[PDB]
Design a protein around this ligand. Structure first.
Ligand code: CDL
Ligand code: PC1
Ligand code: PC1
Ligand code: PC1
Ligand code: PC1
Ligand code: 3PE
Ligand code: 3PE
Ligand code: 3PE
Ligand code: 3PE
Lengths: 311, 98, 105, 70, 114, 175, 347, 96, 80, 110
């Protein structure tokens, strides 16, 4: 019965990733004064299926891998870490209810850079390795502000428990006391997933075949939908009736769809950063504000007499 | 003595003898040294959790912080060596023979 | 040279993490709080040379609380004799050791 | 026009509705028609194991009330 | 060394409070008010004797006074209490704040009849 | 078998240290140390030290082995390997991992149960959940008392990290 | 290096050693060694040549391995004692590992194989710090754990230190390697008397630090790193010709100079404990140190004099080097034997 | 808003903790009888197992003191089945 | 002090916001009338069992029941 | 146990999708291709600045590891000490960032 719950988590993840490609091509279409796919299915509903079958029968690129083991383990680690970020998510009830679910997600997202590093070393190209090292340095730079923003908001949560973060927001959305942390969190999640204006890899894993590239692509989109669900739960916490949980489920699903469409709408609106410009954007802009607001959210519940409970 | 602690100490001694038997690279030496640190973390953690000794819960975090700062220092030394010579080979580090 | 600056200045820098029987958060005792307290109150102030032979019983009790070597040895003896009496056949387990009796509370 | 993005968003939203409805209904089916007992701390676990002992059927969720004592 | 001295299984028999954790938590504050004195005698005996073998009769008095507490609930206010611990029992974290009207009815019937 | 999961993860931990300690290359050594850190973190997590295991994943594997792999990729110049069609490039990988997990099974032989069944660890091994703690983790409150009780420890640790920043910026400048 | 950064880093070296000295908790001991190593690494790389980077790498590896073995000793002590007081240890395994770790930190033999190389690679001031200030923390820990130290182990490491620090100084012309082998021999002398009377350990440590600092201060004042370059000093600064060499007659241990005081008090306190063979053989190996260092004294204030012409240009410039405490250290390292019963202040 | 609601959550926390405190003497008495029941069952099975072995004393304390020592997991659940040992020693750690 | 502040709020408003927020976080809890209530709420949160005292005969402040008038009060917490 | 079962399920699904995405196009007998980069073949140039940003990450990540028990540290009875040490840790992280600034360390990847 628990395996039914695990599969009804992980297979709709893959279906939502499949149709996020359609939603992205349609929303980028209408914002660019054109249409997205509307010929393949009825208004494009068969486009992800046709794309998946095309990518899984395309000829392999036939690489001379610098390592067999890392060439195979980079998509496996990318997909496994893409799928394990969903199991503590309280929507309204998590699949795995754990006391340190926030810290679990932060640790499993810190592990996600090895797919980039192993994919870049497992190619023979030096330019692919250089692009992978730059992608890894970008991702580890923005994980810093992820961790400090997340700690600062959990100073209002009270614990690392994800399910408590719904209780925290029963009177107000937590974006109202923490909108600068919300906006720096949002741009930092935009820079975690190599997403425009922070996708310099499209300006590292181009040694893989079309199948494994589809696997990295779907791990990336599972990460994108997941971080939008996590940002929804973290700042825009929905109403939870404990007798009708589907109210919370409809509510956070609408909010997470809007936030994923906001990712789609930011990549259709802005030019990319130069590499040092987003390194500047992290280290000299977001990080001083993040440290100052971390001091502020340490000292504020003490001066307002509003320390949240541990339990 | 105790059972799982023998395994963690044996892992420590295997990584010690890996550090005490250089093959080619300085990075492999730093890897064996930080495997020694990992086994020290695991062993200190299992003792402190087993004893229900509360205030030493912060001890392995401090072990991890100080020795990862140590490892950052080792990586910077390795980088200065590799910028001197081109490779991080331990046989390039033998000018202090005379 | 042990320059006892902490006792000279009357500050506490690291005495609080030193023993298990010290003041702990939320008054949590260690597993061997009483055994370490008895060993410390035995061996206090008499010096280590007298403490190794005059407080040997409290220290053996406290080490056997910490590591449980005599207890694990006794449990292995009882369980291995139980395995021998099952395989020979002169013993059968009771219902409260097979999970058949719907426990006390 | 713009509302042709809505079938894909509808499919993606139904696919994100499935896991939460699934875990809520499975938690109610596996725990006596109620929420799953959360045990983050050892007191909640001690009470949950005490429930499993006092239920008589080796299931923590089967509750016993004033009908059980004399 | 010496033989550790354990009480017999007849020294350990007492009638058990065979109710669930939500049933205990629903009557918890009234149990602390009404069954105060043998509970506090037992916990003073428990932190002073430092031994569960020297506290057995005070623990039996605790179990007896708890059983008399729940009999006195059962004779008077059975249905508001059942309505209250059912609603406490639905919750995962067993919240008090989700069940204020059943708490109000239970407290009303308990203050009236007892 | 399922009782002995901490002992099994320790055997995997020792085998992974034998794996990278024989040092085939620093990159495969880093991979073996990542796997060993994960299984030793599993050893920590199967006593109930959940914050300390998540500190392993977030800090050890999450920052330090990342910087080790990142530095190792900027040295030890890569060269290709065998890349023959999918029996050789993936079937040999599957058979190699099958031999490795069969080795993990094969080291648990009758010479091992002579150490196991004579000194039976399970039955009384993880005594962490012996009685009640309360509405907290003891491990979490002991880590949390770094700020109320561990003042000197915070001062010397933060000063050593500031000095670590200064020291790295001195020795890497090369001037 | 920025002098503010130099002052902050030298205070961090001193702070790490003070933290090892004053703390009662083993984790703070380990922290003090970590802080001391981390802070002393840029002092070695102050000039940024390949020799200093190689020396800093070898020093890092040896001190890091010793720190890991120290923490393993601490962890075994927590197994067998359940506590953290810096006092005696409660397992011979922890005692053995901590004695090995502190012997690696001191560069006592057979863990001596880094001290001449690292002392060669780094400048003279950082070599002075490494051979004087870095000895203080592990000798403090050896002072505090001496109810636990195995006698045969510490005596073996002491005699192997004195023999290898003796036979290392034959083939040497580099002054820093000579001071490093002198270090190995003197640390063997200090740990020989540790389990009998550690006040004589502290006496030998203080007199050795005074004589070592006199020698490194004179080597900095003359800008000499080899024997061959030290032998040009008579034509340049003639008062330096006698001070270096009668300080070096002190360092081997030779009366009436103050470097005879530690070895004589060590022989004196080891024959109270009915050990007659051992101070005799250790001081015969100290005479082997005298053999080589007397040959160096001959080479500098005797035979191999010859000069160069550009000394005629160095004659027109006096020294501007701050020879700090050099007359004080030179008077303390030579004329302190009549004040030998001052050693009770270290009790 | 977070000021008002975190003060309310601290009051609700104190209400839950007072519920626990009111329940603790009952649970402590039941836990005492529980562990004494289990040690007496293990003592009787030690007496009916350790007969052929000479020089054995049933219920011999491994300590030199007569102070009550808190029983280990294998003193209580030692002679029991592996499912009870799993639910006793990895139950809370593995619970979801 | 007012020309420099406008100059740095013209050049670098990110760092001006950072130093201002951090300065408020430093010097503001020393000035707040609610900082004492954080201490009073944290020391009134009962994680442990309130172990009772043996009544010797002269303790007029230690109550005999929770509903006795003497003892520490949390009416300030319900009112605020 | 439920965690490890879910991890094993996710790993098995990932390895199954990788195995299908490697083996399904290899059933094609497409062609045996003959003779299967910006730089020609030269060595990988080391960049000092990428290493400096990795070490700056590692040091601020250790400082973050110190910062992580703060939501539990707020619950203490010694609140003045806790607040002082929390502000001191974030201030030392800021002093590390300021020193990293004012020595041209954050340059050309700022
Ligand atoms: C207690 C332990 C004390 C340990 C010694 C502390 C001082 C030395 C270490 C630090 C250091 O280098 O300081 C600079 C150092 C000079 O170093 P230098 O390079 O050797 O001096 C060369 C010329 O003398 C430079 O001359 P100048 O042209 O620059 O100007 C004259 C200068 C300028 O004078 C001043 O600046 C002094 C006025 C300001 C003082 C501070 C005010 C604030 O005066 C002197 O230097 C005269 C000699 C001073 C005495 C040096 C030795 C002190 C005694 C050491 C202990 C000996 C123990 C023997 C035990 C034997 C038995 C076991 O000392 C001073 O400048 C003042 C020393 C004051 C000593 C006080 C003694 C009692 C303390 C209680
Ligand atoms: C989570 C839900 C959504 C949240 C909102 C986010 C959605 C909207 C996204 C819009 C599109 C963004 C696309 C990517 C853009 C990336 C570029 C960018 O924005 O760079 C950030 C820019 C970078 O600055 P810059 O590069 O423009 O400026 C130049 C900087 N120098 C001079 C150094 C070269 O700004 C920031 O970093 C600011 C972040 C937010 C700070 C919020 C401060 C709040 C106010 C504090 C108090 C102020 C008063 C002082 C104290 C008074 C006390 C009494
Ligand atoms: C010949 C010169 C070298 C030997 C010097 C011995 C000095 C001395 O006091 O010897 C008496 C000591 C007497 O020692 P002791 O007096 O402690 O003897 C043991 C105690 N009683 C008296 C009860 C038996 O002789 C020795 O120790 C003999 C060995 C000398 C050292 C080894 C010499 C090796 C070659 C150089
Ligand atoms: C998750 C996404 C959806 C799932 C994945 C896709 C779903 C559909 C899976 C089956 C698709 C058909 C088989 C793979 C495509 C074969 C195309 C091709 O080139 O065929 C010619 C190839 C080769 O035919 P050929 O002999 O003419 O070769 C042409 C090339 N020369 C002449 C140069 C040698 O056919 C095959 O390899 C046959 C393989 C088996 C056919 C399918 C059996 C049933 C499978 C179910
Ligand atoms: C620079 C350091 C500035 C802050 C110093 C510590 C501030 C503080 O609140 O300390 C109280 C704390 C604790 O005092 P306390 O008042 O919390 O003590 C109450 C007792 N306990 C902890 C059991 C609840 O620390 C100390 O008093 C001793 C440690 C710090 C001593 C000073 C070190 C200075 C190093 C400078 C280099
Ligand atoms: C959580 C929700 C998840 C939803 C996932 C799916 C999203 C898409 C939803 C449906 C979209 C439209 C489906 C129909 C597509 C068009 C099919 C079609 O018209 O095919 C016609 C073609 C030729 O027919 P012919 O006989 O030549 O006609 C000549 C007429 N004189 O004949 C053929 O091609 C042969 C018949 C093909 C039929 C294909 C039908 C669609 C298959 C979809 C697979 C997934 C279904 C959902 C699974 C999850 C829910 C159960
Ligand atoms: C090349 C190899 C293959 C690579 C791909 C696959 C592996 C990498 C991707 C997956 C990584 C998995 C990490 C799993 C552990 C995460 C931390 C964790 O266990 O957190 C959950 C929870 C802590 O929460 P808490 O509520 O405090 O505990 C329950 C008590 N109420 O704790 C619990 O609930 C404890 C449950 C029991 C302990 C389980 C520990 C994990 C299993 C052992 C390690 C497995 C992974 C080994 C490899 C790692 C990567 C190298
Ligand atoms: C039980 C005992 C407990 C502890 C008691 C006290 C122990 C004291 C141990 C002393 C250790 C000395 C370590 C070395 C000195 C430290 C300061 C330093 O770094 O001095 C060197 C410094 C470097 O300057 P720099 O710019 O590098 O110059 C090179 C040319 N450009 O400047 C120079 O190079 C200038 C040249 C002169 C340097 C002279 C340094 C002498 C220091 C030692 C004095 C004698 C020891 C104190 C008395 C005895 C104590 C036991
Ligand atoms: C006391 C509370 C705690 C304070 C410390 C913690 C603060 C939290 C944030 C941490 C920030 C860490 C990094 C700070 C580095 C400061 C130095 C600096 O950045 O100097 C360079 C900068 C000019 O920028 P530039 O070099 O040109 O950069 C290229 C882009 N233009 O020059 C500048 O931008 C000048 C920066 C300094 C002046 C800022 C003044 C703000 C004053 C606000 C009101 C007072 C607030 C109270 C605090 C006292 C402030 C003095």
């Amino acid at each position: 019965m628990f395996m039914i719950n695990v599969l009804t988590l992980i297979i709709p993840i893959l279906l939502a990733v499949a149709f996020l490609t359609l939603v992205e091509r349609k929303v980028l279409g209408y914002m660019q004064f054109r249409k997205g796919p509307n010929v393949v299915g009825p208004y494009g509903l068969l486009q992800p299926i046709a794309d998946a079958i095309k990518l899984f029968i395309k000829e392999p690129l036939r690489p001379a891998t610098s390592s067999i083991s890392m060439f195979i383990l980079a998509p496996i680690l990318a997909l496994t870490l893409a799928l394990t970020m969903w199991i503590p998510l309280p929507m309204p009830y998590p699949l795995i209810n754990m006391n340190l679910g926030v810290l679990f997600m932060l640790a499993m997202s810190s592990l996600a850079v090895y797919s980039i590093l192993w994919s870049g070393w497992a190619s023979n190209s030096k330019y692919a390795l250089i692009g992978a090292l730059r992608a890894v340095a970008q991702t580890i730079s923005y994980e810093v502000t992820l961790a400090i923003i997340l700690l600062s908001v959990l100073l209002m949560n009270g614990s690392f428990t994800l399910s408590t973060l719904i209780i925290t927001q029963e009177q107000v959305w937590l974006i109202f006391p923490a909108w600068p942390l919300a906006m720096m969190w949002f741009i930092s999640t935009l820079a975690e997933t190599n997403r425009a204006p922070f996708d310099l890899t499209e300006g590292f894993n181009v040694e893989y075949a079309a199948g494994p590239f589809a696997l990295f692509f779907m791990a990336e989109y599972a990460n994108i939908i997941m971080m939008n669900i996590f940002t929804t739960t973290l700042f825009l916490g929905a109403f939870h009736n404990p007798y009708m949980p589907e109210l919370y489920t409809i509510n956070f699903t609408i909010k997470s769809l809007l936030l994923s469409i906001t990712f789609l709408w930011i990549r259709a609106s802005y030019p990319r950063f130069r590499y040092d410009q987003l390194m500047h954007l992290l280290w000299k802009n977001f990080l001083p504000l993040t440290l100052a607001l971390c001091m502020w959210h340490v000292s504020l519940p003490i001066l307002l007499s509003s320390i949240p409970p541990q339990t | 003595m105790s059972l799982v602690y023998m395994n963690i100490m044996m892992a420590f001694t295997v990584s010690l003898t890996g550090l005490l038997m250089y093959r080619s690279h300085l990075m492999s030496s730093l890897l064996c040294l930080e495997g020694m640190m990992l086994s020290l973390f695991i062993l200190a953690t299992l003792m402190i959790l087993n004893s229900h000794f509360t205030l030493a819960s912060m001890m392995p975090i401090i072990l991890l912080v100080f020795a990862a700062c140590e490892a950052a220092l080792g990586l910077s030394l390795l980088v200065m060596v590799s910028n001197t010579y081109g490779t991080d080979y331990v046989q390039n580090l033998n000018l202090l023979q005379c | 040279p042990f320059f006892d600056v902490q006792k000279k200045l009357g500050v506490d820098l690291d005495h609080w993490m030193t023993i298990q029987s010290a003041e702990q958060p939320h008054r949590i005792p260690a597993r061997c709080h009483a055994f370490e307290k008895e060993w410390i109150e035995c061996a206090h102030g008499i010096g280590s040379i007298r403490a190794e032979k005059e407080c040997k019983i409290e220290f053996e009790d406290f080490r056997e609380c910490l590591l449980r070597q005599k207890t694990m040895k006794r449990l292995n003896a009882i369980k291995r004799q139980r395995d021998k009496l099952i395989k020979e056949g002169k013993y059968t387990p009771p219902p409260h050791h097979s999970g058949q009796e719907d426990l006390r509370p | 026009m713009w509302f042709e993005v809505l079938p894909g968003i509808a499919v993606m939203g139904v696919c994100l509705f499935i896991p939460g409805m699934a875990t809520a209904r499975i938690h109610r089916f596996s725990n006596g028609g109620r929420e799953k007992r959360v045990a983050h701390y050892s007191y909640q676990w001690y009470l949950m194991e005490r429930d499993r002992r006092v239920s008589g059927v080796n299931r923590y969720y089967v509750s016993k009330g004033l009908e059980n004592i004399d | 060394p010496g033989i550790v001295e354990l009480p017999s299984l007849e020294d350990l028999k007492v009638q058990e409070v065979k109710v669930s954790s939500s049933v205990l938590k629903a009557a918890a504050h009234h149990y602390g008010a009404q069954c105060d004195k043998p509970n506090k005698e037992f916990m003073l005996c428990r932190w002073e004797e430092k031994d569960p073998r020297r506290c057995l009769e005070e623990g039996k008095l605790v179990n007896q006074c708890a059983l008399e507490f729940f009999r006195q609930i059962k004779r008077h206010c059975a249905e508001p209490f059942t309505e209250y611990w059912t609603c406490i029992d639905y919750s995962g974290l067993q919240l008090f704040r989700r069940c204020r009207k059943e708490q109000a009815q239970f407290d009303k019937c308990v203050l009236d009849k007892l | 078998m399922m009782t002995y999961i901490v002992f099994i993860l320790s055997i995997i931990f020792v085998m992974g240290f034998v794996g990278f300690s024989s040092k085939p290359s620093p990159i495969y050594g880093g991979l073996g140390l990542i796997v060993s850190g994960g299984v030793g973190c599993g050893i920590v997590l199967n006593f109930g030290g959940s914050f300390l295991g998540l500190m392993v994943f977030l800090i050890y594997l999450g920052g330090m082995m990342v910087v080790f792999g990142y530095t190792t990729a900027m040295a030890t110049e890569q060269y290709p390997e065998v890349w023959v069609s999918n029996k050789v490039v993936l079937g040999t990988f599957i058979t190699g991992l099958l031999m490795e997990f069969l080795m993990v099974y094969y080291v648990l032989k009758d010479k091992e149960v002579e150490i196991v069944f004579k000194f039976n660890g399970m039955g009384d091994w993880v005594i962490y959940d012996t009685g009640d703690s309360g509405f907290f983790s003891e491990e979490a409150m002991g880590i949390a008392a770094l700020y109320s009780y561990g003042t000197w420890l915070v001062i010397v640790t933060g000063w050593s990290l500031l000095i670590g920043v200064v020291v790295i910026m001195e020795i890497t400048r090369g001037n | 290096m920025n002098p503010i950064i130099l002052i902050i880093i030298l205070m961090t070296v001193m702070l790490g050693t003070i933290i090892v000295m004053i703390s009662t908790h083993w984790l703070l001991i380990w922290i003090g060694f970590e802080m001391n190593m981390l802070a002393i690494i840029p002092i070695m790389m102050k000039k940024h040549n390949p020799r200093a980077t190689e020396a800093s790498t070898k020093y890092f590896l040896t001190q890091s391995t010793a720190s890991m073995l120290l923490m393993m000793a601490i962890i075994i002590n927590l197994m067998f004692s359940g506590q953290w007081t810096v006092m005696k240890l409660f397992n011979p395994m922890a005692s053995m590992l901590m004695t090995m770790a502190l012997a690696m930190k001191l560069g006592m033999a057979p863990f001596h194989f880094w001290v001449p190389e690292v002392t060669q690679g780094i400048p003279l001031s950082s070599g002075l710090i490494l051979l004087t200030w870095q000895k203080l923390a592990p000798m403090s820990v050896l002072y505090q754990i001496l109810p636990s130290i195995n006698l045969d182990l510490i005596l073996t490491l002491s005699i192997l230190s004195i023999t290898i620090g003796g036979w290392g100084g034959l083939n040497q012309t580099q002054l820093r390697k000579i001071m490093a082998y002198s270090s190995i021999a003197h640390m063997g002398w200090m740990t020989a008397v540790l389990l009998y009377n550690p006040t004589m350990t502290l006496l030998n440590l203080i007199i050795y630090i005074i004589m070592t600092s006199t020698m490194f201060t004179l080597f900095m004042a003359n800008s000499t790193t080899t024997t061959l370059s030290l032998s040009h000093t008579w034509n340049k600064a003639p008062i330096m010709t006698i001070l270096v060499l009668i300080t070096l007659l002190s360092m081997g241990g030779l009366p009436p100079l103050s470097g005879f005081m530690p070895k004589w008090m060590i022989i004196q306190e080891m024959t109270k404990n009915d050990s007659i063979i051992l101070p005799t053989l250790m001081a015969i190996t100290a005479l082997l140190n005298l053999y080589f260092y007397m040959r160096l004294t001959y080479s500098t204030a005797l035979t191999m004099f010859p000069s160069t012409n550009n000394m005629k240009m160095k004659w027109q410039f006096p020294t501007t080097k701050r020879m700090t405490l050099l007359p004080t250290m030179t008077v303390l390292s030579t004329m302190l034997l009549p004040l030998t019963p001052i050693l009770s202040i270290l009790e | 808003s977070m000021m008002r609601w975190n003060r309310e959550r601290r009051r609700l926390q104190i209400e839950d903790f007072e519920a626990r405190i009111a329940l603790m003497p009952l649970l402590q008495a039941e836990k005492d009888r529980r562990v004494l029941q289990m040690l007496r069952e293990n003592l009787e099975e030690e007496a009916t197992i350790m007969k052929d072995v000479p020089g054995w004393k049933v219920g011999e304390s491994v300590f030199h003191t007569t102070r009550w020592v808190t029983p280990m997991m294998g003193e209580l659940y030692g002679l029991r089945t592996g499912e009870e040992i799993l639910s006793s020693t990895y139950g809370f750690i593995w619970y979801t | 002090v007012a020309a420099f502040l406008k100059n740095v709020w013209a050049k670098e408003p990110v760092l001006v916001a950072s130093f201002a927020i951090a300065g408020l976080a430093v010097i503001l809890p020393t000035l707040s009338p609610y900082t004492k209530y954080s201490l009073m709420i944290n020391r009134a949160t009962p994680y442990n069992y309130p172990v009772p005292l043996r009544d010797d005969g002269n303790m007029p402040d230690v109550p005999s029941h929770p509903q006795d008038p003497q003892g520490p009060s949390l009416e300030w917490l319900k009112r605020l | 146990m439920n965690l490890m079962i879910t991890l094993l399920t996710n790993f098995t699904l990932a390895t199954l999708l990788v195995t299908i995405a490697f083996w399904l196009p290899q059933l094609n007998v497409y062609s045996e291709k003959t003779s299967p980069d910006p730089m020609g073949s030269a060595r990988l140039p080391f960049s000092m600045k990428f290493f400096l940003v990795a070490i700056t990450f590692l040091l601020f990540d250790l400082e973050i590891a110190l910062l992580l028990p703060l939501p539990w540290a707020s619950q203490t009875t010694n609140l003045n000490t806790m607040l002082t040490m929390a502000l001191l840790l974030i201030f030392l992280l800021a002093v590390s960032l300021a020193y990293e600034w004012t020595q041209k360390g954050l340059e050309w990847t700022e």
